[PDB]
RNA sequence: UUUU
């Protein structure tokens, strides 16, 4: 909608509350932070060897 | 691929930021935000000022940020550029002054789209690719003759996998297209079929939305793909293998990151053995593809300009330009300008050329 | 090159199995029990006939 | 006889064992191709340098590449950690010299007169070069000529490479990162300018 | 036959390997690899014969470092730590570029009880491996996960995030070679859920759930299944599939309703409440009433306030005040109370909130890197008095913490632009483009739009330029 | 093994070896103990040869790694040999240059260890100045490596030399047949800020320029150079050419680098035909001066010993401001050093004879003069030394005993009574 | 040694009084309201005057007297203004006026030293038709750069700059070259740096995690000689330091409302003056926020001046 | 007070 407007000297541009508080302090999220994750998360010797290679 | 020597220089080349650069055998072309298109002759002499051999043309009042050049043997030389308003503009270069001929190659319904990126695909018919602000890629075939009578034929479009901003595009010599998006996703599709092949996401984490693809490049052999992307105020490079679509590794240096601020552009040399990246921190770094290890580093200063009157130490606001960020970088084939060459454009409105020792 | 590689042999400068294990401490029942350069073996907490040279 | 005495010295300081097998310290000292393998190995073997900066490490390592023959009086050290490193290197060299003279090994002119010459007189110059100062200030503060400074920094590059390899051997990642960072920090400008023959 | 026996773990291949090795040794006893193979073959039956074979192999070919590692691992198999340590010291003196000795040393140190040295050795082994060892990748990922579960970290720490990313990459490379590994899949899910990579977590969790379903009748199987289902419900909740999250949480809660179990119960309650909130408010209210740490209380208060009922708001306020009166005073709870009071427009408590906010200790001001207290103080001052005496707290904050960005975001924009440039502060591309566009210059607006063409303000400013 | 005077044509042998190895499709390695000659040799070989690739290997930089002829120093080659580099697989010839060069305080002259550690398929081309100790070293190399060495020694000089002595007079003391003259020496025995203007004026009148003055002091070089104010040697065209060359050359530097005091002073002297060469200069300044001297724009040069070993020094005259040089104290010049420095005073095809002048500020004694000028050349010495790094590396490589390597080193009067298990 | 309260003036400024300075005739004080007030030295509210400088407020001020009397101040907009006591001067060039300045100090040819927000320190030279001419500049020691919070200049020709990361750099005035470099959620910001009037001693008001520390270094060798403690000197941040004419006692002002006097020779405390260490459980001072700045006055004008959070200026 |  703005690029359509763009389709039609260092000039200077002519471009000049409760929502911010609600979004910054009282908006719950479905992505759990690391604090809740810390609150809820719970955390053969022959396979270390090398078998020798074939011989031709 | 270890020693680079400065060759020629030009300060205060444009009146605004130089956003892109491209080169061919005959000349080097650059664009800027003032709206002009400049041509720099590659075949120079000793102790000749590059501003003496330069030709400028006014294109758009809004400014330009992308450019590409096509040269093929009747000799045709085409330039395509994108403006800040969103237009796609084609010009024909003819020579010993330089003549700019505006070409009207797009129909009326194709002039309502806002384009961002573009790239030429040379014959090995020539092809043109472009990205849209809506997340679409367009494929064209260029026919010069029917006698000179150029036409652009639309082949098809590729939609976005998810829509997001399409920021970068590339085309390989084996017939592949890579598109980068602003969330860190890269899509690879087939040229002859217009069907997507691979779709891999390169994000370190999704906690914050500061991931974005800035550049995608294909290896000269076409079997490798390099990706430059953001990581919340850092710059990262990841290498992928295009035949089967698997992650190879990453390029990093102590400063898990390739650059300190942001990686703007990438470039391969002729053999595809060395990769160069340009950073917002004001550095050029060169990497070995096989060993994934850094080779060399170049530093950019405002005092590199040969003529002392063209040195721009500060901008219009007083901020220092002692170590300016690099916008774009390009490798030049042997014989264009003995050995390979390199060009880059910076924040101090300068364009610089380098030579490889050997 | 690297320190992980061995040099090629210089030019001009100058019963193998039996002579190799001549100084190995053979314990009872005829079996090696101490690696070379060490002083102890593992302490948990037909093969002798194979002397075919 | 010299070979036997050097074997005795190498066994005394726990570089090789009684069977003439190379130990960890000898393995690390195999990499250092400069003139002081033993002192450098003893310096980088422990966690002494664990609180230093890359600039401080590259400044301290200049004692091993600077001949120390100068007439101008030494200015005060620019950083306390540089003074601490100076003291540590001096005590290490005193101990090693006593061990050497125990076995009556003949000493070269440089090895015997190490602590007599002012060999710590380029730490400030290398420090300020690594911080980011230009060559003009460096020359306005240096106690030598341009060629000597260029030579010292050029050799410090290879010293950094050797210390990187030794740190990979020892198992110290932080030292490896610091040495790579210092190598990138000091390699710039006219000191490492490309040759006019290339 | 030895390779087949190692992969499949069946006795009949070990005997065939022993037969073949004995016949080859009879035909020619001068070769070292035959003794190596014979030592590996009998490594579980008789350790004395294996030690003899390894020693003879060392004698025949002394420039081979795999015999020493085999002997050290055999010593570790019979629980002889000092013998293995001595052999590994020799091996490190002999082949430093190899990664096996570092892995063995790290295993010994981890068994002994050391934590820092074990982590350092695991990291060194992983870096030296260069993607050639599955064991190195698995051990490194497990160590990184074990060090960062209950360590009290924040998302703003770059090093922890980079460690988690490296562990995730290592686990992907590991899965390319050995999929269907339960422990590696669990570790991968734990890392991915914490990096907010939910699609990969969905795929891996589907694979793991299939594996556990095929593998099952016991008791511990049911408990592990319940824990996996709880994590899988968390993944759906984070992915936007609320119905599936509710179903999985209910299924997991059913099997562990009469019992490590407390963590699963808390997770199920949180997931059910948040899934129901996004919109049956009664079920969410009941589940949140079913439920310290200062974070559960804040989340519950936020949800109950956003419900929109007078009883819910009163309950949230009462719970926050109870926490304040019980566990002391902190910054987040006071900020939440202040925001709720400001939104509800209660005049009597506003003055007390303003006084308490202005009487903050210096420690809380050091902790507050986002400068929320000055913001709330100015908002309350402007609402109460309709004057312009609220910038004084901003001036004091800029005096005390002059390198911050949020303090200069209000006073002088040139200061904020200069402070954020050249790496003095860590700033993203969106914020930098906004700073550039706030210069009102055409060049700056073009640069800011180049840095972020999907920014509405940059496009609007460029359009307004003409 | 070739031992001949400098500029007698020892580079023809090296070029023929390179071409012969190229014909067989094998490789050649050229090594020197001076790190400032690698770049000059690289440029010279790249100019001389066509269809043959030339590469350069140093501590950091690598140029054309997969070439036919690689140029490095002896320390690089020794490190490669100890680390088992795969480059040596295809190498057929190894060229050792400046074998006679001896310096105690330099840890880079290690060519006997290189000879000891080289494989069986590699042949050698050793080049040096004329020495009286050739057969012992050639015999040791032949015995140790079991290769057939041939000894070529030549005292013939393409251009003869004369030795003269400078109060406002030039008295010849040694003619072109190396015959000391005593009548002129006695006549000399009978008979500052103005010395060098007078010397330069006399030489310019006699047309014996360009000249090189050998000064064994870094500060005295610059003092004498500054004592030459008022004299000029260039016209407008040459000055413009020199200015353009310097401007193009210093393009690679920053603006603050181009403004350094040495660069300004060097340009000021260079635009008049004067220059100074010593070890206290920036490397780029030394390269600029050497290239401009090679091109032929410089008539007067003040140089220390660092210029004697240089590659391209075409001079008509050589002047010795003194006979004593500090090394541990002031010491008279050895006959070998004087011969090496004075042998550069001739040009093939452009000169008929070589002029060498010794400066007498009170006369000079005859004993020291004869010892310095006509003396027995210095013998070839062994620089092999035992180091802890070598011992540790050989103990790490458990296949070669250190005692055996020690016993196969060169030693004057070695015991020929070794029966190994005999 | 004791001190007696002499004069007081409450509600002096409308906003926070951030800095104070005095000379042989006047005492000046700036605030965030944009006023600077000149108080006569011979109630003091009836001998006071006010002037308006900038609407963004002021946070630094200094006085130079030599019949010359000059005042320099810095605003929250990054400006740097001069006044001839009130007659506004124009000494800064057009391109130099584009910079952002934080702190200043009159070095009594006369000198002026100022710091920037990018870590750069500027040194001038005042020539009375008055003009300024830039002698040079000093860049940030570290990369990336930091905020330059404090600056001082000594009579012997030394300059000390403190940064917000805890680093203090000593540089010369003759050649503008560095001499020393000390590197002493946590805070370590350098709040104040001072030179002893007589001798070779530098006092640095260091910062701990919500604690105030003072550390003493000695010049010409760059050796740490100890720290003052009662190793914390105050229970809150230490805001400013001050020496007397002799240089034997050092006064420190803290955010706990206390003025502690110390002895230079013995490194021991002398007396404490409360404007109105005890730590409750975390590191919180039991006292209330106190003093912003303090300044000794020599004999004939010994006395001292104090500005507090209560918007009052006190003389002792 | 040459040379590295």
Cβ contact F191:F169 at 8 Å: yes
D155: nearest nucleotide, CA–C1' criterion: H4
Which candidate in G140, G144, G169, G177 is best for mutational testing of the D interface (most D CBs within 10 A)? G177
Cβ contact F318:F6 at 8 Å: no
User: Whole-angstrom Cα distance, residue D107 to residue E146?
Assistant: 54
DSSP H or E stretch at residue B228: strand B224-230
Nearest to G210 by CA among G285, G289, G127: G285
Secondary structure of G284-311 in HEC code, one letter for each residue: CECCCCCEEEEEEECCCCCEEEEEECCC
Provide DSSP, chain A. -HHHHHH----B-----HHHHHHHHS---SSPPHHHHHHH----GGGGS-PPPP--
Residue of C5, C13, C14 lying closest to F84 (CB–CB) = C5
Tell me the three state secondary structure of residue B121.
strand
Whose CA is nearest the C1' atom of nucleotide H2?
F216
**Are 3 or more Cβ–Cβ pairs between B and A shorter than 8 Å?**
yes
Contact F281/D147, CB-based, under 8 Å? yes
Nearest to B356 by CA among E228, E145, F64: F64
Distance of CA B223 to the CA centre of its chain: 20
Cα end-to-end span (Å), chain C: 39
Q: How far is the CA of F253 from the C1' of H3 (A)?
A: 28
Nearest residue on chain F to B311, judged by CA atoms? F255
Helices marked H in F193-314: 195-206, 218-226, 236-249, 255-258, 261-270, 283-295
Strand order in the sheet with B224-230: B213-218, B224-230, B235-241, B246-251
Tell me the three state secondary structure of residue E435.
helix
| Third-level CATH fold of B1-358 | Methylamine Dehydrogenase; Chain H (2.130.10)
F103 C-beta less than 7 Å away from strand H: yes
User: Whole-angstrom Cα distance, residue B105 to residue B143?
Assistant: 11
User: Whole-angstrom Cα distance, residue B263 to residue B275?
Assistant: 13
Which residues have C-beta within 8 Å of that of residue B264, sequence separation ≥ 6? Answer: B214, B215, B228, B278, B279, B280, B325, B326, B327, B328
Tell me the three state secondary structure of residue F246.
helix
Give exposure, D93-108, as e/b (b: 16+ Cβ within 10 Å).
beebbeebeeeeeeee
DSSP H or E stretch at residue E381: helix E372-385
- Residue keyed to tokens 């907010």: E196
Q: How far is CA F344 from CA E16, F335, F340, G302, in A?
A: 81, 15, 8, 82
Work out the widest C-alpha separation in chain F, in whole angstroms.
Answer: 81
Cβ contact E104:E69 at 8 Å: yes
Helices marked H in F129-235: 134-145, 183-190, 195-206, 218-226
Q: Is F251 annotated as a binding residue?
A: no
User: Whole-angstrom Cα distance, residue D172 to residue E306?
Assistant: 53
**Are 3 or more Cβ–Cβ pairs between E and B shorter than 8 Å?**
yes
- Hey, which residues 127-166 in chain E have their CB within 8 Å of chain B? 155, 161-162, 164-166
Which residues have C-beta within 8 Å of that of residue B58, sequence separation ≥ 6? Answer: B35, B36, B37
Cβ contact E411:E398 at 8 Å: yes
DSSP lists the bridge partners of residue E445 as none
Which token pair is E292? 């310290």
Helices marked H in E95-154: 100-112, 116-129, 134-147
Which token pair is A18? 């409760």
Q: How far is the CA of F279 from the C1' of H4 (A)?
A: 10
User: What technique was this entry resolved by?
Assistant: cryo-EM
User: Whole-angstrom Cα distance, residue E312 to residue E309?
Assistant: 5
Chain B residue numbers with beta carbons less than 8 Å from the beta carbon of G118 are 320
How does DSSP classify residue F125? E
Cβ contact E300:E269 at 8 Å: no
D148: nearest nucleotide, CA–C1' criterion: H4
Provide DSSP, F43-89. HHHHHH-SSS-EEEE-SS-EE-TT-SEEEEEHHHHHHHHHTT-GGGG
Give exposure, G241-259, as e/b (b: 16+ Cβ within 10 Å).
bbbbeeebbbbbbbbbbbb
Q: How far is the CA of F298 from the C1' of H4 (A)?
A: 27
Q: What is the Rg, in whole angstroms, of the alpha carbon atoms belonging to chain B?
A: 20
Chain A residue numbers with beta carbons less than 8 Å from the beta carbon of E270 are 32, 36, 40
Q: What is the Rg, in whole angstroms, of the alpha carbon atoms belonging to chain G?
A: 19
F217: nearest nucleotide, CA–C1' criterion: H2
Residue C12 backbone zone (phi > 0: left; psi -120 to 50: alpha; other: beta) = left
User: Whole-angstrom Cα distance, residue E166 to residue B203?
Assistant: 12
Chain G residue numbers with beta carbons less than 8 Å from the beta carbon of B317 are 98
- Residue keyed to tokens 């104070």: G20
Pairing state between β F211-214 and F300-303: parallel
Q: Hey, what's the torsion of the CAs at B298, B300, B306, B312, to 10 degrees? A: 180
F305 C-beta less than 7 Å away from strand H: yes
User: Whole-angstrom Cα distance, residue B90 to residue E426?
Assistant: 40
Which residues have C-beta within 8 Å of that of residue G280, sequence separation ≥ 6? Answer: G286
Nearest residue on chain E to B232, judged by CA atoms? E428
User: Whole-angstrom Cα distance, residue D66 to residue D86?
Assistant: 14
Nearest residue on chain C to D20, judged by CA atoms? C37
Handedness of CA E159, E162, E166, E167 (dihedral sign): positive
- Hey, which residues 14-33 in chain C have their CB within 8 Å of chain F? 14
Nearest to E327 by CA among E292, E285, E282, E363: E292
Q: Is F342 annotated as a binding residue?
A: no
D117 C-beta less than 7 Å away from strand H: no
Cβ contact G21:G28 at 8 Å: yes
Which token pair is E121? 């050795």
Nearest to B328 by CA among B281, B277, B287, B288: B277
Whose CA is nearest the C1' atom of nucleotide H4?
F106
Which residues have C-beta within 8 Å of that of residue E106, sequence separation ≥ 6? Answer: E118, E121, E122, E125, E139
Chain B residue numbers with beta carbons less than 8 Å from the beta carbon of A4 are 114
The burial class, CB within 10 Å (0-12 / 13-18 / 19+), for E122 is buried
Cβ contact E306:E279 at 8 Å: no
User: Whole-angstrom Cα distance, residue G45 to residue E166?
Assistant: 67
Residue B272 backbone zone (phi > 0: left; psi -120 to 50: alpha; other: beta) = left
Residue ranges of domains in chain B: 1-358
F36: nearest nucleotide, CA–C1' criterion: H4
User: Whole-angstrom Cα distance, residue E231 to residue A40?
Assistant: 9
Q: Give yes or no for A43 touching E (CB within 8 A).
A: yes
Q: What is the Rg, in whole angstroms, of the alpha carbon atoms belonging to chain A?
A: 31
Q: How far is CA F236 from CA B48, E71, F295, F298, F379, in A?
A: 21, 83, 17, 15, 50
DSSP H or E stretch at residue D129: helix D123-131
- The contact set of B with A (CB < 8 A) is 62, 84-87, 112, 114, 133, 316
Q: Give yes or no for A13 touching E (CB within 8 A).
A: yes
Tell me the three state secondary structure of residue G89.
coil
Which token pair is E454? 């999907």
Q: How far is the CA of B283 from the C1' of H2 (A)?
A: 42
Which residues have C-beta within 8 Å of that of residue F285, sequence separation ≥ 6? Answer: F262, F263, F266
DSSP lists the bridge partners of residue B188 as B178, B198
Which residues have C-beta within 8 Å of that of residue G196, sequence separation ≥ 6? Answer: G202, G203, G243, G247, G264
Cis before residue D81, ω within 30 degrees of 0?
A: no
- Residue keyed to tokens 């103005």: F194
Nearest to C42 by CA among E52, E90, A50: E52
Tell me the three state secondary structure of residue G122.
strand
F277: nearest nucleotide, CA–C1' criterion: H2
Number of helical H runs and strand E runs in chain E: 28, 0
Cβ contact A43:E149 at 8 Å: yes
Nearest to E103 by CA among E122, E76, E119: E122
Which residues have C-beta within 8 Å of that of residue E342, sequence separation ≥ 6? Answer: A21, E350, E376, E379, E380, E383
Cβ contact F300:F292 at 8 Å: no
F337 C-beta less than 7 Å away from strand H: no
Distance of CA G197 to the CA centre of its chain: 15
- Hey, which residues 4-33 in chain A have their CB within 8 Å of chain B? 4, 6-7, 10
How does DSSP classify residue E256? T
User: Whole-angstrom Cα distance, residue G304 to residue G316?
Assistant: 6
Which nucleotides in chain H lie closer than 7 A to a protein CB? 1-4
The pairs formed by B176-179 with CB atoms below 8 angstroms and a separation of 24 or more are B176/B218, B176/B222, B176/B242, B177/B129, B177/B137, B177/B139, B178/B216, B178/B218, B178/B225, B179/B131, B179/B137, B179/B216
Tell me the three state secondary structure of residue G7.
strand
User: Whole-angstrom Cα distance, residue B16 to residue B345?
Assistant: 12
Q: Give yes or no for E462 touching B (CB within 8 A).
A: yes
| Third-level CATH fold of G1-316 | Methylamine Dehydrogenase; Chain H (2.130.10)
Residue numbers in D 28-67, CB below 7 Å of strand H? 67
Which token pair is G280? 């409750």
């Amino acid at each position: 909608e703005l690029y359509q407007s763009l389709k039609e000297e260092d000039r200077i541009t002519k471009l000049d509350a409760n929502d911010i508080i609600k979004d910054r302090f009282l908006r719950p999220s479905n992505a759990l932070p690391w604090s809740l994750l810390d609150m809820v998360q719970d955390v053969d010797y022959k396979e270390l060897l090398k078998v020798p290679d074939p011989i031709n | 691929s270890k020693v680079f020597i400065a060759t020629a220089n030009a300060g205060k080349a444009h009146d605004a930021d130089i956003f892109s650069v491209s080169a061919c055998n005959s000349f080097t072309v650059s664009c800027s935000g003032d709206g002009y298109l400049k041509v720099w002759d590659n075949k120079l002499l000793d102790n000749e000022n590059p501003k003496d051999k330069s030709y400028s043309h006014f294109v758009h009042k809004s400014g330009l940020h992308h450019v590409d050049v096509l040269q093929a043997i009747f000799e045709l030389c085409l330039v395509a550029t994108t403006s800040f308003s969103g237009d796609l503009l084609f010009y024909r270069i003819t020579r010993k002054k330089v003549i700019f001929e505006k070409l009207d190659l797009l129909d009326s319904d194709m002039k309502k789209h806002s384009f961002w990126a573009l790239k030429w695909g040379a014959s090995n018919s020539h092809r043109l690719v472009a990205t849209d602000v809506k997340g679409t890629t367009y494929i064209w075939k260029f026919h010069p003759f029917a006698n000179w009578s150029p036409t652009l034929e639309l082949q098809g479009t590729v939609e976005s996998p998810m829509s997001q901003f399409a920021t970068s595009v590339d085309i390989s010599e084996r017939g592949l297209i890579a598109t980068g998006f602003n969330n860190g996703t890269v899509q690879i599709s087939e040229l002859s079929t217009l069907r997507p092949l691979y779709n891999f996401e390169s994000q370190h984490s999704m906690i914050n939305n500061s991931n974005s693809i800035r550049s995608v490049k294909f290896s000269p052999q076409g079997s490798l793909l390099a990706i430059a992307h953001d990581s919340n105020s850092f710059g990262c490079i990841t290498l992928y293998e295009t035949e089967f679509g698997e992650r190879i590794g990453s390029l990093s240096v102590p400063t898990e990151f390739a650059h300190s601020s942001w990686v703007m552009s990438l470039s391969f040399n002729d053999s595809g053995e060395t990769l160069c990246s340009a950073g917002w921190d004001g550095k050029l770094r060169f990497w070995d593809v096989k060993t994934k290890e850094r080779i060399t580093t170049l530093n950019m200063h405002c005092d590199d300009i040969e003529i002392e009157e063209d040195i721009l130490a500060v901008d219009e606001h007083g901020d220092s330009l002692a170590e300016p960020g690099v916008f774009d970088v390009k490798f030049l084939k042997k014989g264009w300008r003995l050995n390979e060459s390199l060009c880059c454009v910076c924040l101090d409105r300068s364009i610089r050329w380098f030579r490889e020792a050997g | 090159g690297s320190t992980a590689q061995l040099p090629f042999t210089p030019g001009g400068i100058p019963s193998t199995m039996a002579n190799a294990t001549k100084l190995l401490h053979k314990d009872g029942q005829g079996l090696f029990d101490i690696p070379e350069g060490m002083n102890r073996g593992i302490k948990p907490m037909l093969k002798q006939l194979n002397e075919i040279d | 006889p010299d070979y036997e005495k050097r074997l005795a010295v190498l066994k005394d300081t726990e570089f090789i064992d009684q069977n003439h097998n190379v130990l960890l310290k000898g393995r690390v000292a195999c990499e250092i191709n400069s003139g002081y393998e033993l002192v450098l190995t003893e310096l980088i073997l422990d966690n002494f340098l664990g609180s230093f900066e890359p600039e401080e490490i590259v400044a301290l390592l200049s004692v091993f590449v600077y001949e120390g023959k100068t007439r101008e009086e030494e200015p005060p050290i620019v950083t306390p950690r540089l003074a601490k490193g100076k003291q540590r290197i001096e005590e290490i060299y005193k101990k090693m010299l006593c061990v050497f003279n125990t076995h009556q090994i003949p000493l070269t002119q440089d090895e015997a007169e190490f602590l007599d010459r002012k060999r710590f007189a380029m730490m400030n110059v290398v420090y300020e070069w690594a911080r980011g100062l230009s060559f003009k200030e460096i020359m306005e503060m240096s106690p030598e000529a341009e060629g000597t400074v260029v030579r010292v920094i050029t050799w410090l590059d290879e010293i950094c490479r050797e210390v990187k390899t030794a740190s990979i051997i020892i198992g110290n990642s932080t030292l490896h990162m610091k040495m790579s960072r210092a190598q990138e920090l000091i390699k710039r400008d006219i000191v490492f300018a490309a040759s006019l023959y290339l | 036959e030895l390779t087949a026996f190692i992969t499949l773990k069946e006795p009949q291949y070990r005997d065939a390997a022993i037969f073949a090795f004995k016949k080859s040794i009879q035909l020619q006893s001068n070769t070292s690899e035959t003794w190596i193979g014979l030592g590996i073959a009998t490594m579980d039956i008789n350790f004395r014969v294996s030690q003899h074979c390894f020693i003879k192999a060392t004698a025949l070919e002394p420039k081979a470092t795999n015999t020493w590692f085999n002997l050290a691992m055999l010593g570790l198999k019979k629980k002889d730590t000092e013998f293995a340590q001595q052999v590994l010291n020799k091996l490190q003196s002999l082949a430093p570029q190899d990664s096996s000795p570092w892995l063995g040393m790290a295993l010994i140190l981890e068994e002994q009880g050391d934590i820092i040295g074990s982590s350092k050795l695991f990291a060194h082994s992983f870096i030296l491996s260069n993607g050639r060892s599955k064991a190195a990748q698995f051990m490194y990922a497990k160590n990184v996960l074990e060090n960062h579960i209950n360590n009290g970290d924040d998302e703003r720490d770059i090093e922890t995030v980079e460690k988690l990313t490296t562990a995730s990459i290592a686990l992907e490379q590991f899965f390319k070679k050995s999929p269907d590994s339960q422990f590696a899949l669990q570790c991968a899910l734990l890392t991915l859920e914490r990096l907010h990579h939910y699609e990969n977590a969905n795929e891996l969790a589907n694979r793991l759930i299939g594996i556990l379903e095929k593998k099952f009748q016991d008791e511990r199987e049911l408990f592990n299944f319940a824990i996996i289902k709880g994590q899988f419900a968390r993944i759906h909740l984070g992915l936007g599939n609320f119905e599936l999250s509710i179903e999985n949480a209910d299924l997991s809660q059913g099997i562990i309703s009469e019992s490590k179990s407390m963590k699963t119960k808390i997770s199920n309650h949180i997931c059910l409440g948040l899934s129901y909130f996004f919109d049956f408010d009664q079920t969410l209210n009941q589940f949140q009433e079913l439920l310290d740490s200062k974070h559960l209380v804040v989340l519950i208060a936020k949800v109950l306030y956003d419900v929109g009922e007078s009883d819910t708001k009163e309950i949230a306020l009462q719970e926050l005040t109870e926490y304040i009166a019980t566990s002391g005073a902190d910054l987040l709870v006071t900020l939440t109370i202040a925001a709720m009071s400001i939104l509800d427009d209660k005049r009597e408590d506003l003055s007390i909130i303003l006084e308490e906010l202005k009487a903050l200790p210096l420690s809380k001001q050091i902790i507050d890197k986002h400068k929320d207290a000055p913001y709330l103080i100015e908002e309350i001052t402007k609402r109460l008095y309709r004057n312009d005496t609220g910038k004084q707290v901003w001036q004091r904050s800029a005096y005390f913490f002059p390198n911050n960005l949020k303090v200069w975001e209000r006073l002088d924009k040139n200061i904020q632009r200069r402070i954020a440039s050249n790496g003095q502060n860590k700033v993203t591309a969106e914020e930098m483009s906004k700073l550039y566009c706030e210069s009102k210059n055409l060049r700056s607006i073009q640069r800011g739009m180049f840095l972020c063409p999907w920014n509405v303000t940059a496009v609007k400013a460029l359009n307004e330029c003409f | 093994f070739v031992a001949a005077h400098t500029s007698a044509g020892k580079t023809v042998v090296a070029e023929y070896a390179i071409a012969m190895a190229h014909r067989n499709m094998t490789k050649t390695i050229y090594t020197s103990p001076i790190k400032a000659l690698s770049n000059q040799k690289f440029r010279d070989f790249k100019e001389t040869f066509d269809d043959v690739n030339i590469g350069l290997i140093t501590g950091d930089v690598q140029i054309n790694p997969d070439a036919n002829c690689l140029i490095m120093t002896t320390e690089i080659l020794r490190s490669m040999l100890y680390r088992g580099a795969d480059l040596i697989r295809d190498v057929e010839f190894v060229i050792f240059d400046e074998v006679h060069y001896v310096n105690d305080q330099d840890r880079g002259v290690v060519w006997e260890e290189v000879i000891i550690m080289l494989p069986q398929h590699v042949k050698f081309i050793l080049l040096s100045a004329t020495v009286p100790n050739t057969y012992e070293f050639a015999n040791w190399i032949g015995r140790t490596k079991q290769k057939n060495i041939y000894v070529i020694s030549t005292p013939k000089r393409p251009v003869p030399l004369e030795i003269n002595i400078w109060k406002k007079e030039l008295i010849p003391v040694i003619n072109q047949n190396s015959e000391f003259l005593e009548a002129n020496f006695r006549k000399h025995k009978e008979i500052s800020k103005k010395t060098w203007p007078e010397i330069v004026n006399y030489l310019r009148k006699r047309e014996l320029l360009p000249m090189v003055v050998f000064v064994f002091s870094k500060k005295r070089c610059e003092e004498y150079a500054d004592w030459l104010e008022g004299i000029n040697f260039c016209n407008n065209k040459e000055k413009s050419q020199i200015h353009m060359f310097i401007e193009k050359s210093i393009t690679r530097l920053k603006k603050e680098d181009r403004d350094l005091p040495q660069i300004l002073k060097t340009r000021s002297l260079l635009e008049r035909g004067i220059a100074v060469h010593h070890g206290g200069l920036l490397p780029i300044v030394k390269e600029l001066i050497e290239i401009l001297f090679s091109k032929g724009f410089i008539k007067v040069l003040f140089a220390t010993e660092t210029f004697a070993m240089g590659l391209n020094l075409p001079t008509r005259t050589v002047i010795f401001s003194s006979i004593r040089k500090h090394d541990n104290g002031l010491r008279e010049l050895t006959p070998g050093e004087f011969t090496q420095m004075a042998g550069r005073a001739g040009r093939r095809g452009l000169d008929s004879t070589g002029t060498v002048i010794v400066m007498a500020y009170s006369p000079l004694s005859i004993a020291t003069f004869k010892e310095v000028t006509m003396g027995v050349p210095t013998r070839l010495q062994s620089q092999f030394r035992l180091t802890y790094n070598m011992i540790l590396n050989l103990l790490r490589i458990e296949a070669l005993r250190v005692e055996e390597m020690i016993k196969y080193s060169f030693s004057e009067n070695a015991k020929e009574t070794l029966q190994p298990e005999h």
